[PDB]
A paper describes a structure:
As an FAD-dependent hydroxylase, 4-[name] 3-hydroxylase ([name]) is able to ortho-hydroxylate phenylpropanoids in a molecular chaperon-independent manner and has broad substrate specificity and high catalytic activity. Among them, the HpaBC complex [name] [name] (EcHpaBC) has outstanding activities and a broad substrate spectrum. More interestingly, we found that EcHpaB is also capable of hydroxylating a series of phenylpropanoids to generate a wide range of natural products. The highest titers were reported at 62.7 mg/L and 34.7 mg/L in whole-cell catalysis studies, respectively. These results indicate that EcHpaB has a broad substrate spectrum for the hydroxylation of a variety of phenolic compounds.
In order to further test our hypothesis, [name] [name] was designed and generated by employing a loop containing residues mainly Gly, Ser, and Asp, which are usually not involved in secondary [name] formation. Swiss-model suggested that the β32-β33 loop of [name] was a random coil. The results of in vitro enzyme assays revealed that [name] had the almost same specificity constant values (kcat/Km) towards p-coumaric acid and umbelliferone as wild type EcHpaB and had even higher specificity constant values towards larger substrates such as resveratrol and naringenin compared with wild type EcHpaB. The Km values towards p-coumaric acid, umbelliferone, resveratrol and naringenin decreased [name] 137.6 μM, 217.0 μM, 174.3 μM and 349.8 μM to 132.1 μM, 176.9 μM, 144.0 μM and 191.6 μM, respectively, which indicated [name] has improved affinity towards all the tested substrates, especially, the largest one, naringenin. To further examine this, we determined the crystal [name] of [name] [name]. Compared with wild type EcHpaB, the electron density of residues 208–216 in the loop connecting strands β32-β33 was missing in [name] [name] (indicated by the dashed line), verifying that the loop in [name] is highly flexible. The sequence and structural analyses indicated the increased activities of [name] towards larger substrates are most likely caused by increased loop flexibility that is beneficial to substrate entrance and binding.
Residue numbers in the entry:
A (entry chain B), C (entry chain B): 2 to 207, 217 to 519
B (entry chain A), D (entry chain A): 2 to 207, 217 to 520
Amino acid sequence: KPEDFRASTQRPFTGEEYLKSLQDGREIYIYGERVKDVTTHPAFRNAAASVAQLYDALHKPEMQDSLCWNTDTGSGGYTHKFFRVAKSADDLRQQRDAIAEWSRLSYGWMGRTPDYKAAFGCALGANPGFYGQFEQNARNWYTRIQETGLYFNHAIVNPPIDRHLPTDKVKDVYIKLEKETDAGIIVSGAKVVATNSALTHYNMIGDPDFALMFVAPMDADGVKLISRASYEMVAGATGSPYDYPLSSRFDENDAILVMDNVLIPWENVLIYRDFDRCRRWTMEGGFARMYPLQACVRLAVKLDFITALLKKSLECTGTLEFRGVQADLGEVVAWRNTFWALSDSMCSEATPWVNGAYLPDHAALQTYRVLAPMAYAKIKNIIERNVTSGLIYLPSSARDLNNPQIDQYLAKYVRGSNGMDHVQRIKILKLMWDAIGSEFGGRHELYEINYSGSQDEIRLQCLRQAQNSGNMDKMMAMVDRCLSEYDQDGWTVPHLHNNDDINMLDKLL
Amino acid sequence: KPEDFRASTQRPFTGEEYLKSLQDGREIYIYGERVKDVTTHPAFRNAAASVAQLYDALHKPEMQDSLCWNTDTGSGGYTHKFFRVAKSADDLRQQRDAIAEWSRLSYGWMGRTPDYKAAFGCALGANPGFYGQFEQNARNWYTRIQETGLYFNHAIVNPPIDRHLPTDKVKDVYIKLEKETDAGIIVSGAKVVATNSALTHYNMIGDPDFALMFVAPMDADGVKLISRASYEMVAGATGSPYDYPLSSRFDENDAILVMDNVLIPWENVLIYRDFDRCRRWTMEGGFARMYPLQACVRLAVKLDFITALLKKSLECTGTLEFRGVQADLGEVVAWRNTFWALSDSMCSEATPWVNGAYLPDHAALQTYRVLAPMAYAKIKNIIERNVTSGLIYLPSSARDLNNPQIDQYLAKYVRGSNGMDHVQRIKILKLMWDAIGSEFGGRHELYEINYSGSQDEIRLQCLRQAQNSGNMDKMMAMVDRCLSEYDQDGWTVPHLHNNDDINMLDKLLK
Amino acid sequence: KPEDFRASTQRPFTGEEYLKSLQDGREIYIYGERVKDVTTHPAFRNAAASVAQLYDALHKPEMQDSLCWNTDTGSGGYTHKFFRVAKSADDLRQQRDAIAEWSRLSYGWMGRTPDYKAAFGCALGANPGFYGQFEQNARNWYTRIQETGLYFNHAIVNPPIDRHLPTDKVKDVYIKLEKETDAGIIVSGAKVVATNSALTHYNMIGDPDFALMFVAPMDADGVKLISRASYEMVAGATGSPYDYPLSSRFDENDAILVMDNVLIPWENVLIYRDFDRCRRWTMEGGFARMYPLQACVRLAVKLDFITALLKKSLECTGTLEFRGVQADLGEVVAWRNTFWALSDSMCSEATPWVNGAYLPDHAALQTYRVLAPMAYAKIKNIIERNVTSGLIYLPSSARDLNNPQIDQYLAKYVRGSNGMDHVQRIKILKLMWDAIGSEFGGRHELYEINYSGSQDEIRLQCLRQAQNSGNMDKMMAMVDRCLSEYDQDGWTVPHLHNNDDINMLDKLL
Amino acid sequence: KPEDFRASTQRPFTGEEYLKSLQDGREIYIYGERVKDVTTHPAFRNAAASVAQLYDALHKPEMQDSLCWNTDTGSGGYTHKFFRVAKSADDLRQQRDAIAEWSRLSYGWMGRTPDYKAAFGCALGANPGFYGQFEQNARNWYTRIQETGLYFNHAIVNPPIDRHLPTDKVKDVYIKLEKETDAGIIVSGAKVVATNSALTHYNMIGDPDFALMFVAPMDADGVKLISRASYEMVAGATGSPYDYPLSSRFDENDAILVMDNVLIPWENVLIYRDFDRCRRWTMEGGFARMYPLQACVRLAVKLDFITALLKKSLECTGTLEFRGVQADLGEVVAWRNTFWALSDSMCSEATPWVNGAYLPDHAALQTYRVLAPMAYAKIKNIIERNVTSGLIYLPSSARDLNNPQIDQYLAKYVRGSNGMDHVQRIKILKLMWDAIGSEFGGRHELYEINYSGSQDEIRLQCLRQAQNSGNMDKMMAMVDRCLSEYDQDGWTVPHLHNNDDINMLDKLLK
């Protein structure tokens, strides 16, 4: 139904069609109230408009070489390159570049755009046989996501459990099968951290009644979102675009997704009462082996933005001349370079998987995940220790600049160091502040550092990849070879010299 | 005079008297508008009430042992202990404890309360001879600050300069003498980072026309503040106390202070067209040698709060059971302990200064300044890597809890791990979020890491203190002694063995 | 018997008496050979001489005000201040200063000097009633250690266990009671990390047969040490004092202590088949609450040395003029200052304990333990990144300086930046290298970072101290007070303003 | 000529031929004595044997697919792949893999093997026109290095200068032209950090008399090395292979190289009295744009080794079971992965340069240089906090294991946690200790952190590369676009909503 808002079946949504497709009476709450229409609501309307611009870019003739491919479905249509299964390392590189072009439309700040779950679509299309009796659902969902550009999110993090409650009552907390019918399955439960789900068409949701994976439409009866605070709405109500230039347009609301007696049609079921497939899906389904290409590129585009924003901030404060400041900026550049290089390795070392599909280099994926929190924390610390005074006393509002009684003083006392007027100085530094210190900036720090999992778990996943791939045993073979070349009596290889002719310990002792 | 709002001259303001003293038509702007009355304005009214609670505490009988001393002026009155010159190490310890008690009333979140510039009053009273012809102004301001509890701030950071402008035009940016008159001096210019000046009575403001230090009242004609965004107002307009429990009451607005043709009477001048005294004041005036006792204790109280708030957050999420989580919490405890220990050393190693006054240990002050940014950054990182999942999806509003259509789901899906209901879980985690992630939390991170100087400069000040005190030369004497005990021919001291009897190099190489 | 080498019972050993007391046929191995005499052996003779200098300092008239007190035993003698129980905060401060004076005789590099276990002596004398039937042994050992200056070490770390061995055979690994006799107990087993035990008189060694604490003489039959590599001997055999100025005189050999059928007289037993007392000893015995005063001061003296050595190294390389270098040096100063300040707090906040004894502030002890590894790692990193080129190419040997064919080039090409000749430049930088990069320097990095326990365990001990003392509940009371002042309907205290008059959410939504 | 020790001109040295070529009476000092023969001297003989094994690998049939290519000279011979100019991204990838295979023969511990300066040979062969009148010398040296596998090092770091000396006297410290003759130039001066030059055939050495670049043979009269302490000799004299398994065979002595009246024939001169070419050579000559491929791969191979050695050490101590230990190991794996990934990017993003040659990605080179010191420091810290107790008390010597009076106790008390006997436990942990804590280990820490420049300078080089490439301006164009989309009156683009309909500030403040 959502794709029926398109005027053509041979291309994805335009932005205008996407926005119309959201006017479906989805059940969303924020600040204790029901949201009538996400495309007009003060908490969501600009974020929706920002996503709609991504869809518009797909149809600009000058963008289509970098953004789009023909579909592989026989439709005669086209789609964003990352919505179609890659069949070579170069395909992955072209997808890398198409993701980057989309990411640049939000300067790297929207991390859960439609291309993130395009990797889920492609995993379905590349390995549909994984799903057994639901193999045809996988194939059909791949085709649908690819041709239409359907916006998916995933809701996968389980709600907290009160350990002191009876084991009776806590089975109601997790997503669980309630009833099996001929029309599909009825499910109830919740998932937390449903980031930007208010703007999606579908969410993937992932005792055998708990071992499910299925697709849920956002407008299905019983599907509800409970929103977190809206940095977009607060910036609109008490600020301005000048004062909160990122909060006002790129806020991705991290919701709780609730399912209350929701009917999931059988066509939307992918794994059903199946602990074994649920267990193997992360390794074998492909999604976890593919989405970090998007996530790494998106972060790299954000680091492009932050790197130059730091340079511009240091230009206007005048400290960029100093050697130590330039060295700090150079380290930020190195971190920015790192994530582009990891995405290079992802594509260049890609491997054949199944049915001709290629997967990016797996070690590079795990490495991006471990390094990103450290890099982001270090960059934020570099920014704050270099743009010291300049951020703390910024005037409250564009209203200060627009009142000549106040502006007369700002014009004298808050100019930029490099011939820059006060309006441009304050503008640049307010952009940096919205990037790192606003509530939006603080949420993004949380997102970049912890969202991918706990620091232990991401390091364990890195170790497990090295072991499962055989890389660790290959490294161990080198250590074992080294140990084999000597023993407690001396060398065991002929090319090295016995030290008996020079050993002085007998003489000494 | 602001202190004439008191019903008695033998004690500082009560909270109600302090609030009345602020209703003086000071000129403050925020969001393009003039503020009518800071005690009722949506951007300032709770922060003002929060400071007023500090004044109220001074008059509670159960608080006076820890908070108050008699004045040393002969007035028969009393004051907060840090407003009177300390004359022993134990005096400093009592002041340390009185600062701590006041700091606990904002849980460590208000950093520019009146006790901060009480150290400026005491510096004036302890070394008034520093000021030459203005020595009597120093004595009189000490007496006035001490007896009244007048709220001072300092505005000292200079505004930025456009280097491409002519040298004419940019000299108007700094505070400068414009006119010398019989009634005082007329001055214009600006200072940035006038933290909480909207709630103060006076600010200290510090080619000889630029070499000035003087006191300016907040209600003087031509003194103006241009405010930054108000986290208090935003939290009031789009949130609630439950949702922003710190933003809503402890926001200290970091303003730009503008002076436009302000007449400063001669009794308010402390340094006048005097580069030499301006240069020597940081070392010799005493203020810089005394206020870090207040700042270190205030930070330590905040770390008390953050330490236990982290523990409570880990209780809520259930991860406190884990060894690695308990170790992370234990490191936060160690950082918290560090700043209390530094303040112990400040008092125990205090030194006689001038006129019977004592100064806290100088090395401890420099050390606190270097360590605080690293500790705060490390603690914030520990918090985020331990409690993040719990913070990211918190419902928007107390309004969600108060709508049963939503609360029915929150009650089921967001309970605490330890038998705790969802209201208390969400409450604790929203408090942690306001501490570290809200715009208020982000400002406080900037404040703790950056306010005190650049990272280079605070380290240079630490090195210079070690050198100026003679500590570095004493350390160097130990290295020189070590070097003196051998040379290229062997040991030069008799108690160690020549290695000639065991050296094998000739055998190996000849 | 060892103290009978003294010519007087009213003072501790002189250095010469101490050295004679070591010539007792203790059983020590190194490099596969038995050590005849530690005071003349190439691996130990200079370290022994270094310790002997500590004993000599006790008898210099100009040193006795800072180093010595009258004994509290009625002997009419004197002793090092830290060997006598402190009865006030000022006593602890005087002990702090007496420890520092001894530490300066090794420039902070000997960490297991006799004053470390003087705290064990004082714990015995302050709380002898802890030991029940062995209370009189505690009293008698306090008197003996205090009057004589007996050199104790502790051997407490258990050897590793092969988990695949039968539970039979692994009971022989740990120290265990073998036989109870009227002459004492026979024990066998081992302890690792018996640091400098080769130069001690006694070691404290700490199914009920495993729950023991007792004192073992180094010359008891069946007591044996297996030494690690001797940096002293290697520096003597292949270097010189000029080339290894710290290795050659301050090496504290980290031995394995073996007990093979050792008879421990009953007078040497302190805890016997007593799991309860073994468990409570760390909290209640006092030793763990007292020795970190010595350890913190010793580290602070070492940081005094390293701080000025870094400054001197940067003077001779010429980089001290640079702002960033001076800032790095200033951070080293701050770390150095930190440990002196912690020792100040230890003394100033000291508390009455039992029998009039005072204990240093407990939180300060735990804090020193957590901070020291981080500070030492950071300082070493600051040194290496600032004294870059200057360390890597230092000529091999004082023999190079003493051969004019080589010295003619060193004199031209390796001068100091500040008018300093090549001999002094090379000398300073070789001292820095021996401090951080030699095998001795690497061992000291290991010692400062990990010896006090694992990074987790030292942080857990810090948390437990805060909880056990009630500090954590006091901090929690402040958080609870904050939470009590509002609820989901608004403030619960009268002094703050209700936001109902300014709340805009109804209008917005 | 050293290559005349080969039995064939159509391949590089064998190991035995390389060792014979070193028996040339080069002038090397160590411990105050002249070295007679580096291939037999106790300070150099195993390091020489270790390098010789690299040459032997080139001629093993099972190794030649990964190690060797035909020469491009028309000689009909073969060479190590990194000794021939790369003409595509795939060429660089094959070279990357050939470097890795050689690096594995020292487990990543020898960092100045012959393939390091093979990039200098290739730079000469790819851009010989850079050298003007010496272009033909560049071409000829490329041919010679490529066909023979000649072992070059570079000596480029200048000796320290005493600033208190007269300006006369300190100009004799640097390498300088002394005499211009028909047979070549006579030069004197010194360079420090001539790593492993004792085992090389030639060194590149790089007021116009100071602006030189030339090649000097190690056996030229007047060329001398003054060695640092030999970890190989000390390990041989006072240890054993079991006790110091890396020190005993992989020590690369960091010498001072002295030139005293050395005649450099004109065929060995590349830049002569030419400040402009000296200044431009780092950017334009190609060597600096090519050798970091070798250095990054060599480091990655060492991290392969250290990663698994850590795992094996944690197996020995039994702590690998613990979650926090496995996480620490996983971070070491991530750092190891990083440098392999950087080398992937170096090859995949390679660019056409000049004369058909390709250069590796420049940003990746700069990134490797900035990241390597932080990674190595972090890894060493992870190792020490996980395996320290196991390292501190290891028995002194294989002699302890071989004396049954001692071994009886070691067999009981120092077993491995996982059914491993004491000999193997002690062996693994002594290998880890030689890697990180021995004097060799400490030198390698200095080498990985500091050799490449100061921490400031390597970051500045990274920034300059981003600016010079145009990358920074492209990033800045994105920031400028963002700024262009709004102003102080609202949005300037049509797709976003004006907030005038929801802005509440007038209501709040009017």
